Design a protein around this motif. Structure first.
Motif, PDB file in Angstrom:
ATOM      1  N   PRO A  18       0.591  -1.083  -0.052  1.00 47.33           N
ATOM      2  CA  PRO A  18      -0.084  -0.024  -0.008  1.00 47.33           C
ATOM      3  C   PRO A  18       0.724   1.341  -0.027  1.00 47.33           C
ATOM      4  O   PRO A  18       0.648   2.096  -0.821  1.00 47.33           O
ATOM      5  CB  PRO A  18      -0.753  -0.217   1.316  1.00 47.33           C
ATOM      6  CG  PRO A  18      -0.341  -1.457   1.837  1.00 47.33           C
ATOM      7  CD  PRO A  18       0.293  -2.275   0.836  1.00 47.33           C
ATOM      8  N   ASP A  19       1.665   1.363   0.969  1.00 42.44           N
ATOM      9  CA  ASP A  19       2.688   2.660   0.969  1.00 42.44           C
ATOM     10  C   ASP A  19       3.947   2.107   1.429  1.00 42.44           C
ATOM     11  O   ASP A  19       4.755   2.456   2.432  1.00 42.44           O
ATOM     12  CB  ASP A  19       1.889   3.718   1.935  1.00 42.44           C
ATOM     13  CG  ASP A  19       1.561   4.832   1.197  1.00 42.44           C
ATOM     14  OD1 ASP A  19       1.710   4.846  -0.160  1.00 42.44           O
ATOM     15  OD2 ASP A  19       0.936   5.739   1.689  1.00 42.44           O
ATOM     16  N   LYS A  22       5.749   6.176  -1.393  1.00 33.25           N
ATOM     17  CA  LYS A  22       4.924   7.407  -1.837  1.00 33.25           C
ATOM     18  C   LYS A  22       4.765   7.923  -3.038  1.00 33.25           C
ATOM     19  O   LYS A  22       5.612   7.862  -3.829  1.00 33.25           O
ATOM     20  CB  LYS A  22       4.899   8.240  -0.501  1.00 33.25           C
ATOM     21  CG  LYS A  22       4.713   7.751   0.761  1.00 33.25           C
ATOM     22  CD  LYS A  22       5.680   7.289   1.703  1.00 33.25           C
ATOM     23  CE  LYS A  22       5.640   6.704   3.013  1.00 33.25           C
ATOM     24  NZ  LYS A  22       6.457   5.723   3.227  1.00 33.25           N
ATOM     25  N   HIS A  44      -1.727  10.342  -0.113  1.00 31.39           N
ATOM     26  CA  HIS A  44      -1.498   9.448   1.025  1.00 31.39           C
ATOM     27  C   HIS A  44      -2.761   8.416   0.965  1.00 31.39           C
ATOM     28  O   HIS A  44      -3.655   8.381   0.087  1.00 31.39           O
ATOM     29  CB  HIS A  44      -2.146  10.172   2.306  1.00 31.39           C
ATOM     30  CG  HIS A  44      -1.266  11.663   2.523  1.00 31.39           C
ATOM     31  ND1 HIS A  44      -0.155  11.656   1.836  1.00 31.39           N
ATOM     32  CD2 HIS A  44      -1.553  12.701   3.078  1.00 31.39           C
ATOM     33  CE1 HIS A  44       0.443  12.793   2.179  1.00 31.39           C
ATOM     34  NE2 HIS A  44      -0.560  13.392   2.987  1.00 31.39           N
ATOM     35  N   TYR A  45      -2.630   7.304   1.725  1.00 32.78           N
ATOM     36  CA  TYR A  45      -3.187   6.003   1.426  1.00 32.78           C
ATOM     37  C   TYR A  45      -4.687   6.231   2.065  1.00 32.78           C
ATOM     38  O   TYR A  45      -4.953   6.653   3.296  1.00 32.78           O
ATOM     39  CB  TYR A  45      -2.764   4.947   2.085  1.00 32.78           C
ATOM     40  CG  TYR A  45      -2.796   3.732   1.253  1.00 32.78           C
ATOM     41  CD1 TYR A  45      -3.923   2.669   1.247  1.00 32.78           C
ATOM     42  CD2 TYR A  45      -1.712   3.320   0.081  1.00 32.78           C
ATOM     43  CE1 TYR A  45      -3.959   1.673   0.618  1.00 32.78           C
ATOM     44  CE2 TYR A  45      -1.938   2.160  -0.748  1.00 32.78           C
ATOM     45  CZ  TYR A  45      -3.040   1.443  -0.375  1.00 32.78           C
ATOM     46  OH  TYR A  45      -3.131   0.171  -1.295  1.00 32.78           O
ATOM     47  N   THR A  46      -5.771   5.790   1.355  1.00 36.64           N
ATOM     48  CA  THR A  46      -7.182   5.578   1.664  1.00 36.64           C
ATOM     49  C   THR A  46      -7.885   4.518   1.317  1.00 36.64           C
ATOM     50  O   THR A  46      -8.971   4.181   1.718  1.00 36.64           O
ATOM     51  CB  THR A  46      -8.110   6.813   1.250  1.00 36.64           C
ATOM     52  OG1 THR A  46      -7.988   6.963  -0.136  1.00 36.64           O
ATOM     53  CG2 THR A  46      -7.382   8.398   1.553  1.00 36.64           C
ATOM     54  N   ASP A  48      -7.027   0.395  -1.015  1.00 30.02           N
ATOM     55  CA  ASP A  48      -6.042  -0.399  -1.782  1.00 30.02           C
ATOM     56  C   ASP A  48      -6.802  -1.166  -2.707  1.00 30.02           C
ATOM     57  O   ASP A  48      -7.998  -1.463  -2.469  1.00 30.02           O
ATOM     58  CB  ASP A  48      -5.594  -1.420  -0.791  1.00 30.02           C
ATOM     59  CG  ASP A  48      -4.335  -2.147  -1.478  1.00 30.02           C
ATOM     60  OD1 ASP A  48      -3.620  -2.814  -0.828  1.00 30.02           O
ATOM     61  OD2 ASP A  48      -4.185  -2.100  -2.614  1.00 30.02           O
ATOM     62  N   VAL A  56      -2.820   5.298  -3.433  1.00 27.71           N
ATOM     63  CA  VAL A  56      -2.829   6.343  -2.601  1.00 27.71           C
ATOM     64  C   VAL A  56      -3.760   7.625  -3.127  1.00 27.71           C
ATOM     65  O   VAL A  56      -3.651   7.775  -4.392  1.00 27.71           O
ATOM     66  CB  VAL A  56      -1.488   6.869  -2.280  1.00 27.71           C
ATOM     67  CG1 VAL A  56      -0.810   6.125  -1.173  1.00 27.71           C
ATOM     68  CG2 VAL A  56      -0.641   7.351  -3.471  1.00 27.71           C
ATOM     69  N   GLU A  57      -4.009   8.647  -2.066  1.00 32.20           N
ATOM     70  CA  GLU A  57      -4.942   9.712  -2.506  1.00 32.20           C
ATOM     71  C   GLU A  57      -4.651  11.076  -1.968  1.00 32.20           C
ATOM     72  O   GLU A  57      -4.118  11.074  -0.592  1.00 32.20           O
ATOM     73  CB  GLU A  57      -6.401   9.614  -2.269  1.00 32.20           C
ATOM     74  CG  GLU A  57      -7.468  10.214  -2.914  1.00 32.20           C
ATOM     75  CD  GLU A  57      -7.445  11.533  -2.649  1.00 32.20           C
ATOM     76  OE1 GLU A  57      -8.035  12.498  -3.581  1.00 32.20           O
ATOM     77  OE2 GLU A  57      -6.978  12.155  -1.596  1.00 32.20           O
TER      78      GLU A  57
END
Length: 508
Positions: A18-19, A22, A44-46, A48, A56-57
């Motif tokens: 996921p992260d 970045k 940033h992750y919100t 998957d 990431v968003e």
């Protein structure tokens, strides 16, 4: 000022976490005078993606200036091994172009969907997968708003879907200046099939509102309810009790300025052209969108499409070509409650049936006619619109179809007699006398045999009952005229075999 959301697709470019690291956007001095000064924004992750992917968003708000012009933008990634630059497999320095339409911004918020993360660790594989992924993720995201149910959520949903679709219909690429897609030669069917299945899966377990939102999505992405249109027709078929509940549910969504009528006419036209019958249940929503004019007393002058409440639908093809009408009447019987919540629907269904079954229609829905006797007059009107076919039918002296016409007239008499006192004085009009006159004319002109005398007589008796319910002398005179004409044509020779042993005609 203007708020921009970023959404970037990560794929097997690297089967990462996921992260693990970045993702960033960098932008020239247009996005803001921070041209290559630093990574203007980090994402940033919100959520998957899984299945070879991550997401990431990020959000940045930069002053309103960006309305109505092109922005240069580029992706850069944090990986612990380097800062890396993404690259697009473009056959040819170069830019990416982002844009923000002034008109779609009602909330002032622009969502930048459909952005890909292409980097050096063919291209069709990346774009088919990525486009399915992004379109499906946009569908669930936008549907996430419908979790909240009122006009503000509905309008925000339609606006944000329109923002995505603005980028989807013209995700411009740049060569000198940027315009509609060339990097893809836009290809969609592989993505659109998955999106049709995904929309179906997500909506299937207020339904009507769901169906309307689905239909909007469908028509905006130029989607078709591929070979299964019937399912959407189920969503639009109300289970309401009476008009107040149905109109209450519909009012919030349909009150939003949209082309619901065009979308629903398209839906019904396709469900007819592909020869299905579930669409009959959606008709009340089409009627609610149509904004029909009242049933003007001089109705027979109205065209059938405007009388049947099907303005924009070619119902005659469906009526004629569709053979399994037994299923049509079984469906109509199953959804008889719809007739209570929609006055025009009785005219549409009547209009959509072929001639033979109309009697079984009027019998199957005779209780409704007793509750709504004014509809009995629409039956006469419908027979008027059928009248050409009945002539073609009467001209061929087929015992079965002559008996069918006789049964139609007997049903009309049964209705007018049994419900004589319940027919409202408002819907009544001299114009209906004209309808019966024309009916009588058509039968008498077409009916050439003596044994068929019952058909003219019943039509004449229909005129009698219309008179008794109330140009009146004119309608009488035309009826008598047509009757005398018919007698003349049938009684071609003198009364008796003047030998006195016989009558020229046994039935005279």
């Amino acid at each position: 000022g203007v708020t921009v959301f970023f959404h970037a697709i990560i794929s097997l470019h690297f089967p990462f976490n996921p992260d693990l690291h970045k993702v960033f956007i960098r932008g020239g001095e247009e996005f803001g005078e921070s041209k290559w000064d630093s990574n203007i924004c980090e994402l940033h992750y919100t959520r998957d993606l899984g299945h070879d992917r991550v997401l990431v968003e990020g959000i940045v708000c930069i002053s309103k200036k960006h309305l109505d012009k092109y922005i240069p933008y580029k992706y850069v990634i944090y990986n612990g091994e380097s800062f890396e630059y993404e690259f697009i497999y473009k056959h040819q320095y170069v830019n990416r172009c982002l844009f923000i339409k002034s008109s779609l911004l009602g909330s002032g918020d622009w969502h930048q969907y459909y952005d890909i993360v292409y980097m050096k660790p063919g291209p069709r594989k990346d774009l088919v997968k990525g486009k399915q992924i992004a379109a499906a993720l946009m569908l669930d995201s936008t549907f996430s708003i419908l979790q909240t149910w009122d006009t503000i959520n509905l309008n925000s949903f339609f606006t944000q879907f329109e923002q995505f679709c603005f980028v989807l219909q013209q995700p411009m690429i740049y060569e000198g200046q940027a315009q509609l897609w060339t990097d893809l030669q836009y290809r969609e069917k592989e993505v659109k099939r998955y999106l049709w299945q995904h929309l179906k899966k997500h909506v299937v377990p207020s339904k009507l509102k769901t169906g309307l939102i689905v239909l909007f999505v469908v028509e905006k992405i130029e989607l078709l309810l591929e070979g299964s249109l019937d399912w959407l027709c189920h969503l639009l078929t109300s289970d309401a009790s009476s008009p107040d509940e149905f109109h209450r549910d519909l009012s919030h969504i349909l009150g939003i300025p949209q082309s619901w009528r065009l979308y629903l006419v398209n839906l019904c036209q396709r469900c007819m052209d592909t020869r299905t019958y579930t669409w009959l249940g959606a008709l009340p929503v089409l009627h609610c969108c149509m904004e029909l004019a009242p049933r003007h007393k001089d109705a027979w002058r109205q065209p059938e499409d405007t009388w049947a409440a099907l303005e924009g639908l070619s119902f005659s093809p469906f009526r004629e070509q569709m053979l399994d009408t037994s299923s049509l009447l079984q469906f109509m019987r199953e959804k008889q409650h719809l007739l209570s919540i929609d006055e025009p629907l009785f005219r549409s269904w009547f209009s959509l049936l072929p001639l033979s079954h109309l009697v079984m229609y009027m019998e199957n829905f005779i209780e409704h006619l007793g509750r709504f006797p004014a509809h009995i007059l629409d039956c006469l009107s419908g027979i008027y619109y059928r009248l050409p076919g009945l002539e073609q039918v009467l001209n061929t002296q087929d015992v079965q179809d002559v008996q069918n016409v006789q049964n139609i007239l007997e049903m009309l008499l049964r209705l007018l007699d049994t419900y004589r006192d319940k027919i409202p004085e408002e819907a009544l009009s001299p114009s209906y006398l004209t309808v019966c006159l024309k009916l009588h004319e058509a039968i008498c002109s077409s009916t050439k045999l003596l044994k068929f005398y019952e058909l003219p007589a019943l039509s004449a008796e229909i005129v009698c009952r219309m008179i008794r319910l109330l140009s009146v002398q004119t309608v009488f005179q035309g009826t008598l005229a047509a009757t005398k004409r018919w007698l003349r044509e049938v009684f071609t020779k003198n009364m008796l075999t003047s030998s006195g042993a016989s009558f020229t005609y046994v039935k005279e």
